[PDB]
Amino acid sequence: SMSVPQTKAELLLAIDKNFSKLISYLNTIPPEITSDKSMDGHAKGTEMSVRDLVSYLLGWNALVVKWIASDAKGLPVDFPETGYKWNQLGLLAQKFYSDYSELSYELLVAELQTVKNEIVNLINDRTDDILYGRPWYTKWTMGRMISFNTSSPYANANGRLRKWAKNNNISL
Ligand SMILES: [Ca+2]
Ligand SMILES: [Ca+2]
Ligand SMILES: [Cl-]
Ligand code: NA
């Protein structure tokens, strides 16, 4: 649907559309301002930087790749992550923050592009039946696990960046 992809084609489209927009925004923003803690954060009342936002996106995108790739190698997978429950997603996002705290904006953007390319490759190697035809992780399809961690967060990031750019001298 327009809300949540329900086919392989829709998933690829949402990724392509939302990521193309995101990368256009990330390539526009002067890197010199990407450490200002001037964006509203995920939890209300917090603040984050553009670099921090890229770090959060990278963590979710790397995670879904790790789930799929590890499963495909016949390895057990902890969801959402080893040591975390599904009601600890803020805590998990803070792991990403620490994981990537010393990485530059430029390296983060490059890494995000790399893992986005890898998720597209994983999708391309599969079919609609694999992605949407049956459950994969408990009640959820693989395709939904992918959009939940890629196209949906990309679109949220795009909206956050549009709002922020209005107060930071950036047209986009
Ligand atoms: Ca903001
Ligand atoms: Ca505050
Ligand atoms: Cl989703
Ligand atoms: Na989906």
Author numbering: 0 to 171
Excerpt from the publication:
The second, related clade contains DfsB homologues from mainly Gram-negative bacteria, again including many pathogens. We were able to express, purify and obtain crystal structures for DfsB homologues from Clostridium difficile 630 and Escherichia coli UTI89, as well as of IRC4 from S. cerevisiae. For the purposes of clarity, we refer to the first two proteins as CdDfsB and EcDfsB, respectively; however, we have no evidence that they are truly acting as DfsB homologues by undergoing cleavage and release of their analogous Slf “toxin”. The overall structures of CdDfsB, EcDfsB and IRC4 are identical with that of PdDfsB, with strong conservation of overall topology and surface charge, particularly in the C-terminal helix.
